[PDB]
Amino acid sequence: RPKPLVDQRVSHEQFRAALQLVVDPGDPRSYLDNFIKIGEGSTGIVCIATVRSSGKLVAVKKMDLRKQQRRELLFNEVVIMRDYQHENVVEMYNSYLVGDELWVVMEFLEGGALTDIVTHTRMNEEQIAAVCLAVLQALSVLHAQGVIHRDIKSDSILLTHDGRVKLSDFGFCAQVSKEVPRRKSLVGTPYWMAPELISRLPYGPEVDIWSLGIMVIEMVDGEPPYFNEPPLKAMKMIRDNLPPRLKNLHKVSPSLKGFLDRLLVRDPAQRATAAELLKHPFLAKAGPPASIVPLMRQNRT
Ligand SMILES: Nc1ncnc2c1ncn2[C@@H]1O[C@H](COP(=O)(O)OP(=O)(O)NP(=O)(O)O)[C@@H](O)[C@H]1O
Prior knowledge:
Blueprint: E1 5-6, H1 9-22, E2 32-40, E3 45-51, E4 57-64, H2 74-83, E5 92-98, E6 101-107, E7 112-113, H3 114-120, H4 125-144, E8 147-148, E9 157-159, E10 165-167, E11 174-175, E12 187-188, H5 195-198, H6 206-221, H7 231-240, H8 254-263, H9 274-277
Antiparallel strand pairs: 1-12, 2-3, 3-4, 4-6, 5-6, 7-9, 8-11, 9-10
The structure holds phosphoaminophosphonic acid-adenylate ester.
Phosphoaminophosphonic acid-adenylate ester binds next to strand 2, strand 6 and strand 7.
Catalytic activity: L-seryl-[protein] + ATP = O-phospho-L-seryl-[protein] + ADP + H(+); L-threonyl-[protein] + ATP = O-phospho-L-threonyl-[protein] + ADP + H(+)
Domain Protein kinase: 32-283
Enzyme class: transferase
């Protein structure tokens, strides 16, 4: 799997001191048991744990401070989830600092990543629409406050046991305001990266819309475009070539096709916004959380 990409006393100790003030005080082990690793990411490992009193399950993301790509991005993990409590957003209960590590205590998502489902089986339009709705609902709220996710991919999308979709992995979030027009840093996963971002030109919230476009290709075709190619020239191909098309538009309804045509636009000014796309006819096909349950590993094949 391709890993997410981003382009000392005073340095460390000051940064630690900063995070100390941001997070909740104390240590989570005073009420949590059985820290067992689930999977490693880019920022660090995610592991499971139990509430000692109730017996209920939580997740704990552990991120090392001195083992970061770009330290200052760790603030996102705390803040984004703190502020934007939304139906389609992973809940954060608490954040703590332990030694050289940040420990964010968030909700455990049973269904796992959307990556797992995209590669193994391949969903129908009803289910694909259900996902896109859930992501766009979340992304509209973030874009409303001028917050770019910067890392939209199947890996970022997680599920509950009852098939509800939530967005996660906010470690690459950007801020844009009245005085800050666009960002300009090379951030995200290589394949899901927008064309203007790969050319290092100033980019806005639109790079998420494109990223979702690529994530649509994922659900339909199993892979993002050029996934077989090495990331280096795969990014150059996105920068040079026309917008990637689907395998064959034969079984694809014109509803979905016209939807994706708004997502994968080269010129970001013409590219549709999260607000618009919420009213696109394709999202009317979106099935209930129940219709996603069959896709999950436990009930698959
Ligand atoms: N609360 C959760 N419950 C279950 N699985 C999770 C949870 N959070 C993350 N995961 C999965 O654990 C895997 C490893 O962590 P990952 O999300 O890759 O970290 P990461 O890449 O550092 N995120 P980012 O903040 O974007 O850098 C991911 O692929 C997720 O699918």
